[PDB]
Design a protein around this ligand. Sequence first.
Ligand SMILES: CCC[C@@H](C)[C@H]1CC[C@H]2[C@@H]3[C@H](O)C[C@@H]4C[C@H](O)CC[C@]4(C)[C@H]3C[C@H](O)[C@]12C
Ligand SMILES: CCC[C@@H](C)[C@H]1CC[C@H]2[C@@H]3[C@H](O)C[C@@H]4C[C@H](O)CC[C@]4(C)[C@H]3C[C@H](O)[C@]12C
Ligand SMILES: [Mg+2]
Ligand SMILES: [Zn+2]
Lengths: 184, 1336, 251, 10, 153
Amino acid sequence: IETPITANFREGLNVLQYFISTHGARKGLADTALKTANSGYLTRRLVDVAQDLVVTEDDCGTHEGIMMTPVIEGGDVKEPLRDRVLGRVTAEDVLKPGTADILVPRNTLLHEQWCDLLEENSVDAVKVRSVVSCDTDFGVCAHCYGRDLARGHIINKGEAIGVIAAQSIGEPGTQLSSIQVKNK
Amino acid sequence: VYSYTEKKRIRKDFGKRPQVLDVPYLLSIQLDSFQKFIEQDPEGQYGLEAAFRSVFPIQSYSGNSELQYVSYRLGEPVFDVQECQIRGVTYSAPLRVKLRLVIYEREAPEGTVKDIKEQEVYMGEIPLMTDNGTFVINGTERVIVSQLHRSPGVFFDSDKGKTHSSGKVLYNARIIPYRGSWLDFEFDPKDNLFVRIDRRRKLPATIILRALNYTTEQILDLFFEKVIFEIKLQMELVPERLRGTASFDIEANGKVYVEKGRRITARHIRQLEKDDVKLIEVPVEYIAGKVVAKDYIDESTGELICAANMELSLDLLAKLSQSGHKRIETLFTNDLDHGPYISETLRVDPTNDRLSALVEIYRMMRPGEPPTREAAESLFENLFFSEDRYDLSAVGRMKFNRSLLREEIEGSGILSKDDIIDVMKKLIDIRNGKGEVDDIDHLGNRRIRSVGEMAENQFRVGLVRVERAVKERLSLGDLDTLMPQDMINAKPISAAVKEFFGSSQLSQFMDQNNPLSEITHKRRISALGPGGLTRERAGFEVRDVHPTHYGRVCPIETPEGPNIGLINSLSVYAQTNEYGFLETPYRKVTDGVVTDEIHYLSAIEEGNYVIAQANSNLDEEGHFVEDLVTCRSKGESSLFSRDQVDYMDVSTQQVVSVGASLIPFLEHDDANRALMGANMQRQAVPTLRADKPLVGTGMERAVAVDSGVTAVAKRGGVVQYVDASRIVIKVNEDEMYPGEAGIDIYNLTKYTRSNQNTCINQMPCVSLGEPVERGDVLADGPSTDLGELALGQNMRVAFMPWNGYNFEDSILVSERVVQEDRFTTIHIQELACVSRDTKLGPEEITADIPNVGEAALSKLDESGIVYIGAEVTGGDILVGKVTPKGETQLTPEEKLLRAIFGEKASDVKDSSLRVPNGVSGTVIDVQVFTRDGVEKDKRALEIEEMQLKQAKKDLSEELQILEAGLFSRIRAVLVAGGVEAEKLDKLPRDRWLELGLTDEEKQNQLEQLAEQYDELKHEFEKKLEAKRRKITQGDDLAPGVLKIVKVYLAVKRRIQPGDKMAGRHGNKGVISKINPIEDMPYDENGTPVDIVLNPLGVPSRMNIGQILETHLGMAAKGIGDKINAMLKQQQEVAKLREFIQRAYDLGADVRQKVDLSTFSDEEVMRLAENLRKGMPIATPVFDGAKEAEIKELLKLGDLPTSGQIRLYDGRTGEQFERPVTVGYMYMLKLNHLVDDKMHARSTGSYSLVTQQPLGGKAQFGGQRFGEMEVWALEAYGAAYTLQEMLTVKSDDVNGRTKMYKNIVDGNHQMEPGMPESFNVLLKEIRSLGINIELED
Amino acid sequence: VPLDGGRFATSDLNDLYRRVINRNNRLKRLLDLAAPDIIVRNEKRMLQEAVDALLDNGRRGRAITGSNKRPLKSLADMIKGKQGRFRQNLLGKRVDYSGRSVITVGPYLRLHQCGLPKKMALELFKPFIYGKLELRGLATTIKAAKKMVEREEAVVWDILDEVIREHPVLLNRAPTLHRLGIQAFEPVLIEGKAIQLHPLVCAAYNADFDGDQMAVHVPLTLEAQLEARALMMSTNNILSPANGEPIIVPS
Amino acid sequence: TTDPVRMYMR
Amino acid sequence: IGLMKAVDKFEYRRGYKFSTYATWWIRQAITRSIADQARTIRIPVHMIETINKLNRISRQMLQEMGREPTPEELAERMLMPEDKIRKVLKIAKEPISMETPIGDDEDSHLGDFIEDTTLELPLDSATTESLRAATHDVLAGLTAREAKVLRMR
Ligand SMILES: CCC[C@@H](C)[C@H]1CC[C@H]2[C@@H]3[C@H](O)C[C@@H]4C[C@H](O)CC[C@]4(C)[C@H]3C[C@H](O)[C@]12C
Ligand SMILES: CCC[C@@H](C)[C@H]1CC[C@H]2[C@@H]3[C@H](O)C[C@@H]4C[C@H](O)CC[C@]4(C)[C@H]3C[C@H](O)[C@]12C
Ligand SMILES: [Mg+2]
Ligand SMILES: [Zn+2]
């Protein structure tokens, strides 16, 4: 509506702006109820697909992985390398930016000190072991997964990571020219 | 200008806008709706008259005999409302109608009358509505909420392009009757008209036309236009039809009229019409696409040259030319304006005649059966057009005619061929582009049906069954000596009516939390229910707030949850139109002056006016002040010149309901919080002593009085007698109705249970020898204080954190609040002990109970029933009953113990009524219901004796009043006929009989009066006998039960942590601590604070209305404090008068004006006494007090205009920095008490088939451990917790007793086993054909 | 089953079963009369309908209805759906040793403990109290212990304080969206009837103090107690499992 | 059709 | 089945149109079928006739006398000791289905509220075991011959 509500709540809304206020509030409450129901259904399906997955080994031994690098959407970078790579296990050696000598050997859990080293050497290319590329059959290995994120250490054999993944994805669900270089 | 009940406490008003319309009677919808039902209507169109005149007369098959309707009436209900509630029976009246069975003769042509028999037949009892809009059905009060349903008529709607990706829109037109079938037309993505009859398979639309005896030629003539050609090869042309793109430009007048290829333009048409062009020549091939209109045959051999609706080709042109045809008629069908939609429907139509169409309809409607001419014809003619099987009600006819743009507002209730044809034409127009579809959620398309209408519908439904039965009986026998009473049974009609009133979705237990909840329950509108949409199948379009709700439905008050927007409340001034549409009042504006005559406008009617807003400044003469006034036109709002407005709003409250008009400073609260505030305000519990709001809106008195809780005077008079239980008023001589004694009595309702187990109690608010006027309140119901609604208490509040004891929404409460019983409530509950008869022998209620060591039998009297007044606690025996049992088959060890100690067996159980654990009240009432063949032990006789005493007393008083009235009449109409001046009292009463005075016109009738006196005496002897027999009659208990004893317990609940409190601005919380009084913050005067609230709850919720209330509350209390001081130092009335008069005239030209110069010193001092706890103040909804006026009123006291003072810490005595906001806020105690919410269990009763714990506090059940909790325990590694919760704790039948024994043996180990639900699953899968087994 | 007042309550299956038998019997009867084949065929069709309605009702035509006007429940309907064996009774049972109440603040608590009402704890821990009473000689038999707890003697409260000492209880709020919606605490006996919840945990549960309620369960076995203490305690769950960030932030 | 009664009638 | 029963037992000699003879047997068969198959707790035919007669007389008395006949009045209008009338009125109507939607919340039904009364409370079983132990101990206190005499007794 082209004419806005110019009165705040310290003043009063007159009887004709309160009607529009009510339009909005009534829409909001119903959309909230919808959000809850839909998120519940998604979470149920997501735990059904992935319930049986468990850590059932300690090292598959594979070398393949996923190349983790900061994600940049056109302009600035909204997710640095630390947040993407923290806690994972390196698949290949991390060479120096000059390619001269290795920085972190291999299969080392990247905790805070290692990430500080990575930032100090200004490296933007780490390859890390992923679940989707795990050799272990009927389960996952503790090194491919990563670390716990709730106990701050490499995950324990036995943990049900599928239920945790489903719940982690599902519970936040209720809460939802020209170029210009800016540096020398 | 102030009523005697309003000169005790005048509430100061800050309203600035004038009042021209008084708030109507609030619950008038219910009363008027039901009054229209049971009411003798001469021109029967309302209620039972309509149903009778519509069903009767029942002409039997062959017309041998017939049954006629004469009249009806309602008898007197056997029990009044109170007796119905006590006894547990419905309050209803018997319906008795006069029927006249007429038997003809089967010999003469007609008009024979062999005989006529008139008889009166009873056909069901109809429940009666009390004088407050409720029904008493089985001892409880029911409310039947109105329903908002789609009006019958015709509605055109599209799917707005949401069924096919093509992007085009499909249009449809539905016809809804009041009862019948739904005839829906629709368009196909291929532009084919289709029709469905009851949401069934589609058919080409034209088929119905064929079923209506229409020929293809006639159909085309109805729908399409004509292009006529003559032969050479000349076409008649009208300039406008070639509106356009021409293959051949023109041949007119020879030379030229327009060039080929170029598109026809407006100037071309203008020149063509100017020249008056009629006929031209065009290429023969140009006529190779057009469609012929009618059939063309050859005269040589009578052969069909070309059929109607057949494509025209060159060869067919040649055949017609050689067949002597000159005139050729085709259909004009362009692409934009006139489309060829019926021609394609004819193409796809297989049927060719009426019979084929009827066969197709019959095959589609009821497949399987072979079609038949007779059956198909009957089915079609009976689908519509038939009175009994189809009705398009008067409202439906009105909307049908008004939608098809007809001037006739009345007509037949059945369809016709014209109606269907016109609806099809309208749909075709909508498709072409001339017209608009309807809005479904418009409040001009939705009407309201209330109790009377629904009840009439169900009564007619029953009457139809009775009609069928009567016809069937009259079919056979055909005997004489048959009265109109063996053919009618009350079971069907009474069954339908009882089903509606007792067990229906729209009839529900009344809300008796407080007066507001009752009022807002009665005036409620529900879209759900029979005949209305369900909840799951309702997307957020009917749930929205349409612009047509402005003044008819409340935008705020609506439940939040599954049905939000499906249940809403009637607005304050809205009333229902004659046809059932909501309408609202507007004050009419002439040329420039705002007149005083109000018109009620409807939703559709209101569209084409411009209505000025309520808060539009007016001159002293009625003229508008501003040149441009902000008013809302058809759909939107904007500025309009003062010279083009014709209506104005009648008030600023008319947009909100009664619930939301009680929230002060509603403009400053967010809409979400206002919604919550109204919803919670309906839930407050009445407290021990009522406390009027210090800050209100002026709607309190209307709500309190228009509800039935209070006792209001019927006629003026002087209070002759007052008491805790009755008020006797001595009417004025101006309202005497000379036949009357002249006094009226009001019997107050003392402590009684409500639907919610709360207390209902009326206490007088008048005093002996005090004047009253009609309309004044004589007694205060629950939650009213001197006639004003009072739902809570005004507490002294401070906004500050204070140590995390109000962390999220918790509330910190002083102990002086608890000491003073400010939020103490009374709850009354009834417990029943039923003694039945078993196959082993009847149960007996007795004081000799086995295995009771005589300690618990102290409260029980000699008959085994607790004493009245006894203070009981959990586990105490209320009624002592025992049940016989068998032999019990002792174990080999109990035998040894019995042999050692020689203890004997019982042979009777200990099934007795005992107080449920955790409840501690006093017994306030016991009542016993015995069967008609039982002994009536001593306690029942004692209860009967006291009842007889009370009844005799009451009847005696009523008889004496009647006798006094009759003797006063003897005196007044015998003031002549014998001089007796001093003898007025010399003779005894049985002799003011023969008084008199100087002969005059007031002589006449001693014989008549003496006869009437004896008649009264004998009548009241009969009345005494009737009430005695009604007291002493046995009850009709449910079969098998010998007797019942009901005990009423009155508990008094105090306030404690866990109880939920709230204000009016949607701000709620749970009490967290009861702080000692010396730990609360205090100010430099020493006064502590009652409650400490959190300031972090305001900013994020934007419900700052509460803050203003607090500020204003402080101001109000300040005034009271000042008065109190002047009233404690015994100041002379001059100073008190000066101050109170100064405080009643503040603000900027407010409307309210109170002149204390006209108050006698007694009046002023009584007012000052009522104002010493704070001066009440009114802040109407959208024109309230402004912040400047609050500051000014604070200054009138001695308070700081900031509203903030400096507070000290009770614990340390150090002052809090940065002063805090303290004031007075009105707090409510919601009906969510932690007493009713705490629950625990370790072991109890288990279900029957799947042996798991039952559910519910009442059943001592367990807590669901659902799927989500199982996932949570799987996310952890907790595999032993999960296993114990799945087997040993729930349904591992022999693994849970082992666990119990292990626990009591100090060994914490489980031997789980397998749950008993998996075994049920295996047996049920195996009881199908499958073979599921456990492999080893 | 017999209800109070000489009135029975029955399952729908009985009804359905009866149908079958009736029609079946009639068929066996009809074949003994050598009836015309039209009647026997009609009876066989009716028997097929009866058996089909028994096994799965409302799937081969119209659903048979009871004395009410709602369809009967068949063997197939007793297994499927949210109100069926699998969903409602094999995953989602109700539980003993459980209670619920309204939660308040209690800002004095430590992160690992909660406030539990005396009246609730005297009910959840009843067998443990019986064991203690009969083990310490205060009660001669289990019946005597039941009497003592019913009367609420003075020693009962001391035995209760001794039984609750180091015995976790699981608290749960109804929408368990993630695994931090169940947590184990050490009870602290309080007065009143409201549970007291440590403030720093409220974000994990998504709980405010304007009317919310919680359910409390007590683990019985030794393994369940050790799992509550080692896996589910609130002093072990201070990091979120969705991201490594703390979930014990002051609010 | 699906109704046994319909088939019997036929 | 009733038409088939008539046919075999019909005669043209009596010269009575067939429908007249058939209708009686057809109606008799249908009525006996209703008496047998209709109820889940089968009630004999004579008791069914008694109930139907009671209903007819109650209908007549409701239509004529006014409010409703009482068991005493019904017994008077009929001819029974008035204690038989009580039993006939007490004959239970059709059982309530255990799936009747009482719950009106979480789709709860009547069957969820009916407990199992044949179970033994765990405290009862614990007491039984405790009594067994106590009796064992007491008998062990006594000598052997008397112990076994009591045990076998
Ligand atoms: C009506 C809303 C659903 C539910 C509350 C209604 C629907 C039918 C009601 C039962 C029967 O009517 C009669 C039964 C026997 C006695 O008469 C009283 C008890 C009895 C079990 C009733 C309990 C309850 O009242 C029922 C289940
Ligand atoms: C929503 C809560 C309804 C509840 C107040 C009332 C309404 C009808 C009551 C049931 C019926 O009487 C039928 C049974 C009678 C037997 O004695 C065993 C209990 C039984 C299931 C009753 C339990 C409870 O009392 C019910 C559910
Ligand atoms: Mg909350
Ligand atoms: Zn791996």
